[PDB]
Amino acid sequence: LSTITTHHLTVPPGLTPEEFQELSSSIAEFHSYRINPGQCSSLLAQRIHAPVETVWTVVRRFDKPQTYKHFIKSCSVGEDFRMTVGSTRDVTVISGLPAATSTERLDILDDDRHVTGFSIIGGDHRLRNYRSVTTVHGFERDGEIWTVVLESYVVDVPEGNTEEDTRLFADTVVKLNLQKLASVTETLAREA
Amino acid sequence: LSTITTHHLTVPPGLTPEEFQELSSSIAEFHSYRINPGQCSSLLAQRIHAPVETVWTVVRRFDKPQTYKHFIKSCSVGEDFRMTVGSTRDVTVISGLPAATSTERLDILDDDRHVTGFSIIGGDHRLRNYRSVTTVHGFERDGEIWTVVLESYVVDVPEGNTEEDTRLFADTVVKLNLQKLASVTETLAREA
């Protein structure tokens, strides 16, 4: 019943075909998931007019997701926290429901290829077993540079929800966070 | 136990003191509420670099809230719908919870003073008895014009939530929608 995601075969909304053809191999490598019934997966994309390493400095900051994410009341890490795979963070989410904290584990951190990813290991019943990967990519035309960020996830569809409603919620949130990422990092680039 | 909101006595975040002093009378008139225990109220503000009537054209469009609001899957009005006080709209919200539609009634529509407001009369248990008012205001300095939008609400705090968590949720959503309003209407002004 399990299948393989097809994100690497379709142009993500927002991206040009030409951008996608350059990214196709990277989507297969980092944005491919094993999907079972009762699960759903999406790939989202955002163009940013900022250098790759400027964007990556924000995307890799596992201890401060609120720097580019919405609906975060607080994020606490350990006193001996170090940016290593396997570290965790406790994220308190604003949702209008009673106070709910998610524990998230850092799954990937590749400073050379600009790939990171995390898993919600407990605490969010909207996004049970959420797993996500973000990659950053540089582009150039005629001395003009820009960056594309790709963010994908897989998550369990909660009992009582349709896939479309879980997908639409999770997509809307990723889309909004990527917009904030674009604004934050574009500002950082203009200021130098 | 009931008190009166104090939004007209504090500078809203984002606004300058000078802007507030010009708006103080309008906040008292339109952004004042009777507040009971178990209720909470906020006033949010957004500067927009667009003419008042450009902003008002979007803010008054009760049948298309998705034009400037986030997390809206659909909005349906009647076949014989007319922009009159007492009309309703059914708004389907993206929330990661099972499909939930809110029925909202148009409470105020003043095209001369640029005031509108609505009530959720059923269908959202996060925002039970939510009531909101939006006003639009023009400003000028040395031939440069800009607009300030004020949006306030009162809502019931759900049983099991703190006031701070209901306030933070509702504030975050209003803030994000006002940002979208700013981007949408600024684009409309640049295009003419």
Numbering used by the authors:
A (entry chain A), B (entry chain A): 28 to 219
Quote the study's own text.
The binding of the plant phytohormone Abscisic acid (ABA) to the family of ABA receptors (PYR/PYL/RCAR) triggers plant responses to abiotic stress. In the resting state, the PYR/PYL receptors are monomers or dimers and display a wide empty ABA binding cavity flanked by two highly conserved loops, named as gate loop and latch loop. To investigate this issue, we have selected as a model SlPYL1 which is a tomato dimeric receptor with known structure that is involved in the induction of stress responsive genes and drought tolerance. Interestingly, the analysis of the structure of SlPYL1 shows that Glu 151 is not involved in the dimerization interface or interacting with ABA; rather, it is located in the latch loop.
To investigate the relevance of this amino acid on the receptor function, we generated a mutated version of SlPYL1 harboring a Glu 151 to Asp substitution (SlPYL1 E151D) at the latch and studied its biochemical properties and compared them with those of the native protein. The overall structures of the apo and ABA bound forms of SlPYL1 E151D are nearly identical to that of WT protein with the differences confined to the area of the mutated residue. In this structure, the apo form showed that Glu 151 and Arg 153 established a salt bridge that blocked the ABA binding pocket while, in the ABA bound form, Glu 151 pointed to the solvent enabling ABA binding and subsequent gate closure. Instead, the analysis of the apo form of SlPYL1 E151D structure revealed that the shortening of the Glu 151 side chain to Asp disrupts the geometry of the salt bridge with Arg 153, weakening this interaction and favoring the transition to an active receptor. The increased RMSD of the gate and latch loops in the apo forms of SlPYL1 E151D with respect to those of SlPYL1 shows that mutated protein displays higher conformational heterogeneity at these loops. In addition, it reveals that the native structure displays a well-ordered salt bridge between Glu 151 and Arg 153 blocking ABA binding while the mutant protein displays high flexibility for Asp 151 and Arg 153, thus suggesting that the Asp151 mutation might ease the large transition – of the latch for a productive ABA recognition. Indeed, our structural studies corroborated that the mutated latch loop displays higher heterogeneity than the WT, due to the disruption of a salt bridge between Glu 151 and Arg 153 which is capping the entrance to the ABA binding site in the apo form of the receptor. Altogether, the joined analysis of the biochemical and crystallographic data suggests that the weakening of the capping salt bridge in the apo structure of the mutant protein together with the formation of an additional hydrogen bond linking Asp 151 and Thr 110 in the ABA bound structure shift the equilibrium from the apo form to the active form of the mutant receptor.
